[PDB]
């Protein structure tokens, strides 16, 4: 119970930190770079999402 409860808290705190390591790009002016930056940002968000979904599923049964 308590070991698994702590792990789940540690896992969610890690998931939140991963989302916080992928902040949205700030220029809002294109510039082909802003387009390349957003594509790069989206790939990383989809990846953090699947990791989170998978990590969490291990705690759900």
């Amino acid at each position, epitope marked *: 119970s308590g070991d*698994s409860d702590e*792990d*789940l808290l*540690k*896992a969610v*705190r*890690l998931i939140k*930190f*991963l989302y916080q*390591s992928n902040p949205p790009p700030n220029p809002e002016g294109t510039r082909q770079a802003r387009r390349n930056r957003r594509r790069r940002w989206r790939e990383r968000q989809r*990846q953090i999402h699947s*990791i989170s979904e*998978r*990590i969490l599923s*291990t*705690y759900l049964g």
Partner: antibody
Amino acid sequence: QEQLVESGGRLVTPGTALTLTCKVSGFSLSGFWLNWVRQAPGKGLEWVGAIYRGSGSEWYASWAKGRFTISDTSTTVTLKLTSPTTEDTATYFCAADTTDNGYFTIWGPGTLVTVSS
Amino acid sequence: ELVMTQTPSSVSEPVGGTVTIKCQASQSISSWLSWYQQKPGQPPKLLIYDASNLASGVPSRFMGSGSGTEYTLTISGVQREDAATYYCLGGYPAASYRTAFGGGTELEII
């Protein structure tokens, strides 16, 4: 580019606290899993634990908890053996996960720890 | 918690033969599976990642596959340089069941 070097491997008496260090260099990434893997002579690989470098998120194998402490530094990741036993005799490797996908792409050459009474 | 049961413990195959190495996961790991090659005195080398993807710089003869709980490492045309010990790595550090290596497979070439 990406490089891992482990140091601290010594001959220790059982119960003598020992710290191993993984020198982390050439990584473009800020946050990534830095894992500790051990191998007793003539035996298989065993996962000890990992830390996600940007954070303080430590994860240990069921058998490793209490006996090992992984600590993160600016340019290093350490593995402290709180109270080693003869069963802890192994080469200790550090391995980095460069994608966050779970697999180990970069390894250090290893550091040998001998625990004898 | 996660246990990776690796079979067989040892395999002897002649040059050009096919080698099949299996890993059974005690829990559902999905694509959280990788294969490694280790030669004496050296650290392990990544062969397969995400269960079925060939790692960069690895010969095309190395094949990875997975269905549910069962994972397979196939070496189609075994070469003399493939004499080593092989390991699977399942799970994830932050998963409830952690991450774990299989017991390994020692490959000898005839």
